Design a protein around this ligand. Structure first.
Ligand code: NA
Lengths: 75, 295
């Protein structure tokens, strides 16, 4: 299924995922596309931070859902 | 009229407090003034010195907590010499936090702004004394936080180098290079309320507003990211971190004045400057404010 990840730079990332994908898996796909390490990513659905050992299904993320990506760059 | 408090003076952990009443007081009618912490805990006071027939000075029997608000409470039943009795307690409030400007913490190793910023927030927090007595926090960090205001330039810089090394040797903090302020807070064992974990909110601001009473430190891990204007309860806000995504500074408040501290550089800043701060950097997508400290 297809999900959309919207960033605060105003980019939409389209991902091909499955309901059983872990959050860590989704961050890995973002890392592949965008070169952002997982530990500098926060993913959000319906106001909630997605946690690394849960699945998309755990949060009721379904086809065509939109997530937000907030970066946490090191300083 | 019944007695009223018309002045309060705190001229430390065991301050002398002066209260002045509108009229002479029957001295026998004020035996158990207390100071109350935000959770209702009462600290008794020692003898009352009668500076005049209507002005008293006293000190708490036990040391008060750092960076904490206390209510001075004069129970109902205080009586004027003219005979009128109060039917409700008389109260006044103060804070134990210092009023001198805060100090810079130089970027000694070149990649420590996240550590310096977190230490600035911790040293302004109501949790400070809990950090200072926490044996899981490295001793060098506790040493630095305990004498931040008093240390000489040389002592502060030595203590800061020792604290940074001790933090870098913890599992939470990177052994070298840049980091995130949360990592340092985890090493300091500072309890944070994660806004995302709120059972009664789906965004950052509402999570803070509807948190359990007396929650003092927040980690802003919901959405959208907050600007300064969006932080609730500005009257009680005393510190927050500010990242550009690549660098951190601290904003800390003492005596009603906000300071921006960029490593060694301390500047006094205006409310207008805080109101102009964005919630995130639109150029890189990185969040501005993740830690908010309230008194
Ligand atoms: Na480390």
């Amino acid at each position: 299924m297809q999900i959309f990840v919207k960033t605060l730079t105003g980019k939409t990332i389209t991902l091909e995922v499955e309901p059983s994908d872990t959050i860590e898996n989704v961050k890995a796909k973002i890392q592949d596309k965008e070169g952002i390490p997982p530990d500098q990513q926060r993913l959000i659905f319906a106001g909630k931070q997605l946690e690394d050992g849960r699945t998309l299904s755990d949060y009721n993320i379904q086809k065509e859902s939109t997530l937000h990506l907030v970066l946490r760059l090191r300083g | 009229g019944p007695p009223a408090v018309v002045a309060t003076r705190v001229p430390l952990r065991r301050p002398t407090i002066e209260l002045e009443f509108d009229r002479a007081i029957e001295p026998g009618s004020v035996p158990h003034i207390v100071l109350r912490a935000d959770d209702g805990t009462s600290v008794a006071v020692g003898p009352l010195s009668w500076l005049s027939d209507r002005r008293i000075a006293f000190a708490p029997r036990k040391p008060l907590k750092s960076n904490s608000r206390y209510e001075i409470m004069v129970p109902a039943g205080i009586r004027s010499t003219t005979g009128e009795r109060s039917t409700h307690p008389l109260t006044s409030s103060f804070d134990t936090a210092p009023v001198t400007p805060p100090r810079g913490l130089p970027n000694l190793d070149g990649a420590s702004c996240f550590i310096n910023t977190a230490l600035q927030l911790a040293v302004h927090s109501s949790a400070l004394d809990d950090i200072l007595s926490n044996e899981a926090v490295p001793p060098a960090v506790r040493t630095l936080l305990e004498d931040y205001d008093a240390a000489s330039a040389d002592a502060l810089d030595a203590q800061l180098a020792a604290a940074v090394a001790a933090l870098r040797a913890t599992p939470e903090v990177p052994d070298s290079g840049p980091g995130q302020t949360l990592e340092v807070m985890q090493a300091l064992r500072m309890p944070l309320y994660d806004t995302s974990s709120a059972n009664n909110a789906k965004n950052n601001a509402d999570a803070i507003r509807h948190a359990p009473p007396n929650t003092k430190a927040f980690f802003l891990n919901s959405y959208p990211p907050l600007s300064y204007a969006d932080l609730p309860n500005h009257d009680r806000l005393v510190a927050f971190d500010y990242s550009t995504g690549g660098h951190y500074v601290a904003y800390v408040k003492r005596d009603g004045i906000w300071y921006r501290i960029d490593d060694a550089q301390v500047s006094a800043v205006n409310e207008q400057d805080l109101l102009a701060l964005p919630a995130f950097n639109p150029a890189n997508g990185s969040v501005s404010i993740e830690i908010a400290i309230y008194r």
